[PDB]
């Protein structure tokens, strides 16, 4: 394309040049001979047929191996004009290796985005490409998918075009495992709308800073990613009737609060703890009494304290500035540092047994003094209330003396709760900005849940995020395959139902329903003498041999102990039950929480102002609230693919990519676009939009039924009359026909305006 000059230096990474296009069309190729054949180490390899034995085929691979395969299992290659094409729905042969090798060949030229009919696939580059500069934001503005190469800016503007045209709320549903590119692609959508609203500022910059401010406190280094978002996020970008940006809401779903006090080896705590320390920043290490290196503050010192990909000194100032731009006042910004400083000291407190009483006493009090000073508490009351809490059972009060191991747990639970409530506060404080009281009518909702994880030790939080991913997959499955085909039968289109097999309700019912895994947790936390082995027994008794997705654990040697295994969509996940009743119930020491309410630090008193509704129950209802509100939107999906486990750029592993293409239903999602009628318009809206293509077809002032007008109009265009169908109230278009009708509309808008201009000369 000669128009690629508007994309500047980004152009080689968005489209192949015409110099490369002429090489593609001049490849040696025989349509009868060039085929894909399966292989073990890499899922499919290109091959050339050398002989035929009826239903058996034998072929020579790209790597010179001989192979023999059955005729149902060998799949024709696309001819070389379909090299690296931008939308895989337009291929002539559509199958697994056609999608695999089209993505691999685009990614090998660093064209990381590809369309898949109605949705887009993103393959993670471990290299910052220049395709995201604000000249490319300008270059994507108002271009259609028929024009511009695929990009996250294309999806953003396409959703924005639907929002204004349909007058319907839109959503961008970004999906993928951990390490896939979900968070930066979220940021680019947020960058796109902000810069477009700047090209038209304070709200535009603040919306951009809202991400790195939350990343300091909400992201952490994990084995799959150095910047894993330990919280799910939904961003509603709000627009007015004229389409200009008007507000944003951030909502966050479930922070991994156990990370605050516990980390596995080979992973970090949250970035905030290490970035304060690693700059050795003179003001913060004196104000927070945290003078040391990180290996002595117990809560953060386990795991890894340094990561090569992150220069914590520069990331500190980036997020310190982020809170400045978001208008956190000096006392607020200092206070939220103070609580992170206190939490570091709060894990160093030492307790010992009193010599006869089976009761804890403080062993060392210097680190409690530091904690109480920063938290504005009284240190004597803190240590007393931590060891000897008052508990009440109606009007009866009694002191229960804590043992040394369970006062340590009480310090852990309090440290988690301060951090969680401070992170929740910070979100509400970011949403105190960004709400600008400008009027709004529509939103585009960008979702970036915590992606799917399989660790060497999976716990209750890994269950919550993997459940959240499975629900969002079933949202895709229901929208693409069930709700789509219901509308064909509802409108009376000649359609016979196709079973794609993409259904997950058996595994969601195993978790959600009132006898499922989480429903056992909400009652087993209520019985005071229940235990984790009592839970595991009741869990197995209800589900082992009664749900196909609930299996016995497969403990391989060397890996830790796991107590059951779930057959999730993205893979089998083995879960350890220890602590789940405590984690679900979340009992805080009410005496020390009473000290927190009386804190001199204005933040800490606010966090615990106002403190049956277990965290699994809250999660399930927040997630069910989300997807009911999400069904009231037009969804755009972005499939983020991690190509490679080792994080090395441009390297791509075919089994790991194919696993993600299969379980995300990518091939099926294209097939319903090719087979079905993916575009459709009400006859009233069709007449409203496209009468300009042939104004003589539908003469107005006479009454005409909307169905009767549209049926006449569509025959006169000289588009293919087989590419559309008529329903009771909608016309239904095949894959490419709306893209053709829009191009026909824009050239006819261009023709009429230039002739209006010609008349504006003709009057002179
Ligand atoms: N589009 C991209 N361009 C450049 N680097 C990327 C891109 N997508 C991902 N990466 C690399 O992968 C890292 C992790 O991606 P991220 O979005 O944080 O993962 P997740 O999908 O788990 O949210 C990024 O910080 C960066 O190093
Ligand atoms: C995704 C699909 C179901 N669809 C369409 O196929 C057309 C829609 N509306 C028309 C009026 C339109 C045409 C061109 C650009 C934007 C919107 N809406 C839609 O929702
Ligand atoms: Mg993330």
UniProtKB/Swiss-Prot annotation:
Residues 83-746 form the Myosin motor domain. The modification Phosphothreonine is found at residue 365. Residues 30-79 form the Myosin N-terminal SH3-like domain. Residues 623-645, 725-739 are annotated as: Actin-binding. It is found in: Cytoplasm, Myofibril; Cytoplasm, Myofibril, Sarcomere. Changing residue 230 to H: In CMH1 and LVNC5; uncertain significance. The modification N6,N6,N6-trimethyllysine is found at residue 127. ATP binds at residues 176-183. Belongs to the TRAFAC class myosin-kinesin ATPase superfamily. Myosin family. The rodlike tail sequence is highly repetitive, showing cycles of a 28-residue repeat pattern composed of 4 heptapeptides, characteristic for alpha-helical coiled coils. The cardiac alpha isoform is a 'fast' ATPase myosin, while the beta isoform is a 'slow' ATPase. Myosins are actin-based motor molecules with ATPase activity essential for muscle contraction. Forms regular bipolar thick filaments that, together with actin thin filaments, constitute the fundamental contractile unit of skeletal and cardiac muscle. Muscle myosin is a hexameric protein that consists of 2 heavy chain subunits (MHC), 2 alkali light chain subunits (MLC) and 2 regulatory light chain subunits (MLC-2). Interacts with ECPAS. Interacts (via C-terminus) with LRRC39. It is linked to Cardiomyopathy, familial hypertrophic, 1: A hereditary heart disorder characterized by ventricular hypertrophy, which is usually asymmetric and often involves the interventricular septum. The symptoms include dyspnea, syncope, collapse, palpitations, and chest pain. They can be readily provoked by exercise. The disorder has inter- and intrafamilial variability ranging from benign to malignant forms with high risk of cardiac failure and sudden cardiac death. This is Myosin-7. It comes from Homo sapiens (Human). The chain holds residues 3 to 796 of 1935 of the full protein.
